[PDB]
Amino acid sequence: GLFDKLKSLVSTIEIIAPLSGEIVNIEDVPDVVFAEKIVGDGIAIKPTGNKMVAPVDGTIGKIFETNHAFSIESDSGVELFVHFGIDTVELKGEGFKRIAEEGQRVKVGDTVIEFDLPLLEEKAKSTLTPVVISNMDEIKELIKLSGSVTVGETPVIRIKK
Amino acid sequence: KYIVALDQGTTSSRAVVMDHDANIISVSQREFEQIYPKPGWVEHDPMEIWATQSSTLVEVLAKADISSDQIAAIGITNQRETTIVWEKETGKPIYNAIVWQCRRTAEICEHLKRDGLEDYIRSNTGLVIDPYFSGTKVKWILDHVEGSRERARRGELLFGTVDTWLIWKMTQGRVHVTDYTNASRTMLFNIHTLDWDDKMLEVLDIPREMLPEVRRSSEVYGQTNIIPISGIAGDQQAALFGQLCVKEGMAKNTYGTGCFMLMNTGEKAVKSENGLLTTIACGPTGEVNYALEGAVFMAGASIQWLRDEMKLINDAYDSEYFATKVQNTNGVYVVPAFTGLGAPYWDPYARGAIFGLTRGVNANHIIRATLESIAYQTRDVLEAMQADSGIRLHALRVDGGAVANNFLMQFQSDILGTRVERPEVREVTALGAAYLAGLAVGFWQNLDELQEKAVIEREFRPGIETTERNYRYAGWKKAVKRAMAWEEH
Amino acid sequence: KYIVALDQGTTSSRAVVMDHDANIISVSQREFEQIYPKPGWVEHDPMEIWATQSSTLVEVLAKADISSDQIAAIGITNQRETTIVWEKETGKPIYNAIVWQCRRTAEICEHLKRDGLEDYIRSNTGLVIDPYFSGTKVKWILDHVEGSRERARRGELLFGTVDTWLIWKMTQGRVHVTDYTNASRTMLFNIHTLDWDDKMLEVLDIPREMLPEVRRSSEVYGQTNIIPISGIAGDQQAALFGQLCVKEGMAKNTYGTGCFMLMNTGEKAVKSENGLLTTIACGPTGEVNYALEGAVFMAGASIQWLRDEMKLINDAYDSEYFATKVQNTNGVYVVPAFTGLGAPYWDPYARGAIFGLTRGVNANHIIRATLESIAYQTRDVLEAMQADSGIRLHALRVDGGAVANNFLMQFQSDILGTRVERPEVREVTALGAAYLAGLAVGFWQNLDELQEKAVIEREFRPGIETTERNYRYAGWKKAVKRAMAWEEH
Amino acid sequence: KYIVALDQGTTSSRAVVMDHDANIISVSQREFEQIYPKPGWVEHDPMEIWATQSSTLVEVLAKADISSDQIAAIGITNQRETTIVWEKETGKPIYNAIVWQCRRTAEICEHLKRDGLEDYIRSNTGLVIDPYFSGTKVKWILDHVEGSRERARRGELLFGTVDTWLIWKMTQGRVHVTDYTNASRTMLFNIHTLDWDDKMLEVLDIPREMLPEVRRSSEVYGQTNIIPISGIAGDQQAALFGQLCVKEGMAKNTYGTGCFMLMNTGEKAVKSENGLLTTIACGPTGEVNYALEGAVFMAGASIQWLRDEMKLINDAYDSEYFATKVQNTNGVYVVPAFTGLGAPYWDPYARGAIFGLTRGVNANHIIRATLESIAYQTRDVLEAMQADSGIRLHALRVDGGAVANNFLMQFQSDILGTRVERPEVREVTALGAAYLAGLAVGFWQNLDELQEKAVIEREFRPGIETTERNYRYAGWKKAVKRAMAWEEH
């Protein structure tokens, strides 16, 4: 069964969880540009269910052509980068159906990419998904949350500007 | 007053006039032919190297109306390794300059290995048995011309890399001198004893009568009525000095004809075990320090091949425009092993190759792959550098003609996953030779009077595309493994 | 009266009007896009294949003011293998034509081998498990669209190679027919039983409801208000008929997009053991003969890549001028495996490559090496042909667009060390399909009324340069061994 | 639901699918040949115009899976003036479309002047005796084919500009209709009486039997099983509607093959005395308004000549890169009078010319001068516009394929010394024809529901270089005076 045409229980910048699962420290992410804050700073997520969603209300900057990752620009002047797993361009597409469009206006919770996690756990070297602010010069304070998150629902980061 | 620097490249001759506190007051570039007799072979005519480098010297001053009176000293930077043997009386070579690039002496090199002289030449020269160095190149000139090894002991003919050929023409024959950085490169000079190694000199049947007086890189060597010649250094070793690197762990990478990455290792000679060289470089006062080195033969020269031979671009500068019109190379790899590989691979038998071609691959996919191979070669030596030194670089200070290209610099920081610090005087090879010269004449007294000038114009950081750096690099290492060992022997 | 031939190529659509005793009275060519979704992939839009091939038909007649009344019959030649699945009611494909070139079904092909179905498909189809054939291409379309294998049995969708798509559009849906030469190519049709093989049809889960009525190559199949359609043959099998080859041991090589060499082997199916195909071709009256085949995927298409993608030449014809400005390729080899190799190698994983590059290699060295790889590929299949047949050819009768190039034809006879007989009507693919059509309508009654037309315009003989043919070819076999197996799987 | 627009250009065929409130949901472009029989002559094949425009229609819907059911209406925009005469039964032209560009009827034009019919044709058609209009082009087809003026009265052959040829092919022969904007262009139609002028029809011996039913631009004309055809307008008159210009003094300039500047002048026909045209355009509900017009024949077509004939650029888009590499044209002027001048000059005898060449003028100086002549031609009509209207424009609202070029747009505002307002949907010719169609079907009811969509993406202002605008323009007016009257007569 699938509940997408079914109504949902809706209800100082917060970055809402692009996907569900446990929040994991980015320095536990086994690729040093993430582990050492090089490309940006934020958190990681050990993913548990099949979609990747717009983490803020803003425009999609770019979806990588292999579909595993995307860039978003919030209206509050923030730029996030969500990348499923590590070295995931090696898959050449396998496991990822792109849903949103390259330069599209999205509101929070809007699906942007769907994925096939059973495949992706067998094949990708790591499934940990970095969500990082790549805009980090411009933001003054970065608060990092913990524990379980649910896609489109739970807050992961609190940035102040 | 001013300092004149005489920069003599692989493909050009540059002379630049400099005032007190490094301002480029005047410059002159003059190109000369590259001679290719056989495919693996490269060659220059020593007379065209002299014709351009002398006329460049007379240009810069005239441009700025200056002559003798105002110039404190003359420094010299030069392409390293290319051997020249000439006539002492006349001033006429018994052959063309065989270039560093040239692969003809690979046959000789193979015998030196089949003997067992590799652990010797490694541990006393810091070098590797390759066609690249002058050692074998002299033997070849000797073995092929008639008079040669008898006119040799009788003393009518002289050896020289480009630093000693240019001063012997500037002082009308008077002084015949090298400096330590250039002699380190010949494979005839011991790097610990700091004098010509004579097991080498034996093995290659070179008479010791041919050789120059090896001297410091900062010392008045003679005068010319061009007036004192006080600095000499191999071009990449003067680029390291121009970067003011000069201390332990300080490094640069120069993007010229080739890419040469060097790290100063103090007054210690470190043994490489990841394919690099142990060479000599200068310290803060022009004294022998050592340095680790990775040298890749083709880099801005590949961009020159697109333009002149291949005719795909018109300006070397139009490669940035066409490379950034396609987002990727569409699986295409250019391996620029036009004169062997070298780099960490050594192997003189690889020739150039373009891999993974498809029906929709266009010219821009080739142009971008050519620029991209410059950044993949830099990563091959950089990780050999880091595994050798035990130091991880957190920025790559760069210089050379090619760093003016923003796509290449950025692509470079994405594939490395490190920052790339570009300076605003980018061709620092003629500054390290001006500094070595100013110091020996008292025009400067030392490097701290010159800290201020190193001003980083731009710093490139790894953007989000750095996440694919190991997928793209793995493709290059497959491509390289197929260009290798093409030529038979 | 006249015969109209409808030649539908990989890259173009040609219709030619012919009078009694083969005079080309009128012709029309119309190009269409080549679609490349992924790198290894090739694709056409069936509607552009129909748009051009219909407008070409309406061109030729108008040019010569002719319509229906004067035309005895219509023959059809077509690019072989490219699968099309469309809608029976509407006349709308559920996907683009996946071309013969396209390599996407290599994954499927690998499973058919890991089962053990290679000795089966070899011995009952005469073919080889490759992405090249339509068998696997249909499975892919089926497996990827939604409705597919249920609309299949329910009979709403139809399979077709280009011969059956064009007639189903010409007879408004009425007749759905193949001929024997085109069906031999699909890997779904038994070549001994002469009907669809149903172990194959099982294995690839294709419903037998999709398939056309396989018929003779010379038979009225239906009428169109374009009037009878009486000849059908795969383009290379109609080139063999146009050459009037038709008897045991008679062969030709066509230089079109690819190079296809075929030898008629009578009413015997010979088993290849040197990498070739056993296919079906016509006899003197349009009946099933067999033929040996070597098919190399890139030949005039490589010359097309120099011109459109690579921009090195402007006219395909200017490749002769620039190729004969350099005397040799200076060690350079172009391996044109843009969509795998195939040829005698099969291996879908090789991509294109240019080897042995040096600093003085220029654009003309690349252009000449590209033309030279067409002659080295022809030699790879020709000696596989000779080792298979047990017959040595003492001349190579050739045809195609590329034989207009004298450098290539001559270089071809030097590397082969055999004569190369060129005819003066060079594009004989649309004559074999006109002959098959004239015969079935009584316009001709038989081939002997057409012997006279084969007039060899030029015969190329091996000049003194044939003495290096095995040094140059050995270089190619080294180059091919390095382009192989590039793509991972 | 959706509106389909069928845009048929001089060089291409475009069909675009549009939802409610103008979103481009899908688009299709398809190029076709330009035929040049003699030098001054231009020509198209009506069958290729139909072949591409029909296949484009079947593309857009398939791309977006849509067919008949969802489409409210079909609007039509077309290149104006090009005459077509075909066969009523068959649907076959007695000749190729003679294009608006084509100069063959200059001989006829010269007789119409030597009579004294210039004050007549000026004051009743708003036009000027030129080869540009269809009037003389029909006479030429008639006078050259055999049957012609007897099959004419007998009614077997029909006249048509591209709007009426496309609908006669869409309604299988049923409706034969023009709209007012397209008929205004033929020089056979009175602009005050709003019916075919029959002193003209006399003079050019055209039978009134050939002519279409002239109708409104917003009216259902017939249905097609493509379903109602409700909008028709000449492409530049639908660009003016797409810009929502529609009121007195509202203007635009479109940069397509040529540059056409038009200003709506209400329900008044203004007499030009500075070389312009008085034409018909639409009002807010699709009714006859008048408009002033300046038409220059070459603009994006010149950029197309650099690319295809001249081969200097590869992409029309690379002209911006190469034009902004030189800072000026180094005295060079390109006068693009490839098919006469026209513009304010009229004179069919001028051909193209490049002036003021020097030894150091390079390809970029030519490329930049070509782009610059587009902005100098726009200034020639703009000041003719301002001197005619008595209104000074304080911004130039622009559209077309060429406005994507920032150098041209900026250079345009510097030479004009006015702002240049660019919109973000730049190809508004297919929107004016969608609006005319939506309105007549009730899909929209009127223009105010569409104000919101005109959103200026960028406004170009005159930078400091506008200070030399009259020095640079004076050079152009010298260049134009020398290209004039080249061809003899």
Swiss-Prot record, chain A:
Zn(2+) binds at residues 68, 83. CDD domains: PTS_IIA_glc. The active site is at residue 83. It is found in: Cytoplasm. The keyword Cytoplasm applies. The record marks 68 as: Important for phospho-donor activity. The modification Phosphohistidine is found at residue 83. Its cofactor is Zn(2+). Keywords: Cytoplasm, Kinase, Metal-binding, Phosphoprotein, Phosphotransferase system, Sugar transport, Transferase, Transport, Zinc. The keyword Phosphoprotein applies. Gene3D superfamilies: Glucose Permease (Domain IIA). InterPro entries: Dup_hybrid_motif (IPR011055), PTS_EIIA_1_perm (IPR001127), PTS_EIIA_component (IPR050890). One of its GO terms (molecular function) is kinase activity. Residues 31-135 form the PTS EIIA type-1 domain. Binds 1 zinc ion per glycerol kinase EIIA-Glc dimer. The zinc ion is important for dimerization. GO terms for biological process: negative regulation of carbohydrate metabolic process; negative regulation of maltose transport; negative regulation of transmembrane transport; phosphoenolpyruvate-dependent sugar phosphotransferase system; regulation of carbohydrate utilization. Disruption phenotype: In mutants defective in enzyme I and histidine-containing phosphate carrier protein (HPr), cells lacking this gene are able to grow on the non-PTS compounds such as glycerol, maltose, melibiose, mannose 6-phosphate, and alpha-glycerol phosphate. It comes from the Bacteria. PANTHER family: PTS SYSTEM GLUCOSE-SPECIFIC EIIA COMPONENT. The phosphoenolpyruvate-dependent sugar phosphotransferase system (sugar PTS), a major carbohydrate active transport system, catalyzes the phosphorylation of incoming sugar substrates concomitantly with their translocation across the cell membrane. The enzyme II complex composed of PtsG and Crr is involved in glucose transport. The non-phosphorylated EIII-Glc is an inhibitor for uptake of certain sugars such as maltose, melibiose, lactose, and glycerol. Phosphorylated EIII-Glc, however, may be an activator for adenylate cyclase. It is an important regulatory protein for cell metabolism. Heterodimer with glycerol kinase (glpk). The EIIA domain is phosphorylated by phospho-HPr on a histidyl residue. Then, it transfers the phosphoryl group to the EIIB domain. This is PTS system glucose-specific EIIA component. The lineage of its organism: Bacteria, Pseudomonadati, Pseudomonadota, Gammaproteobacteria, Enterobacterales. The gene is crr.
Curated annotation (Swiss-Prot), chains B, C, D:
InterPro entries: ATPase_NBD (IPR043129), Carb_kinase_FGGY (IPR000577), Carb_kinase_FGGY_CS (IPR018483), FGGY_C (IPR018485), FGGY_N (IPR018484), Glycerol_kin (IPR005999). Disulfide bonds: none annotated. One of its GO terms (cellular component) is cytosol. CDD domains: FGGY_EcGK_like. Activity of this regulatory enzyme is affected by several metabolites. The non-competitive allosteric inhibition by fructose 1,6-bisphosphate (FBP) causes alterations in the quaternary structure of the enzyme. FBP inhibition requires that the enzyme exists only in a tetrameric state. Salt such as KCl reduces the affinity of the tetrameric form of the enzyme for FBP. Unphosphorylated phosphocarrier protein EIIA-Glc (III-Glc), an integral component of the bacterial phosphotransferase (PTS) system, also inhibits non-competitively and allosterically the activity. GO terms for molecular function: ATP binding; glycerol kinase activity; identical protein binding; metal ion binding; zinc ion binding. Zn(2+) binds at residue 468. Keywords: Allosteric enzyme, ATP-binding, Glycerol metabolism, Kinase, Metal-binding, Nucleotide-binding, Transferase, Zinc. Changing residue 294 to S: In glpK22; abolishes glucose control of glycerol utilization. Induction: By L-alpha-glycerol 3-phosphate. Glycerol binds at residues 80-81, 132, 235-236. It catalyses: glycerol + ATP = sn-glycerol 3-phosphate + ADP + H(+). Optimum pH is 9.8. Pathway: Polyol metabolism; glycerol degradation via glycerol kinase pathway; sn-glycerol 3-phosphate from glycerol: step 1/1. ADP binds at residues 10, 14, 257, 300, 401, 405. Sn-glycerol 3-phosphate binds at residues 10, 80-81, 132, 235. Its EC number is 2.7.1.30. One of its GO terms (biological process) is glycerol-3-phosphate metabolic process. Key enzyme in the regulation of glycerol uptake and metabolism. Catalyzes the phosphorylation of glycerol to yield sn-glycerol 3-phosphate. It also catalyzes the phosphorylation of dihydroxyacetone, L-glyceraldehyde and D-glyceraldehyde. It uses only ATP. Homotetramer and homodimer (in equilibrium). Heterodimer with EIIA-Glc (crr). Binds 1 zinc ion per glycerol kinase EIIA-Glc dimer. The zinc ion is important for dimerization. This is Glycerol kinase. It comes from Escherichia coli (strain K12). The lineage of its organism: Bacteria, Pseudomonadati, Pseudomonadota, Gammaproteobacteria, Enterobacterales.
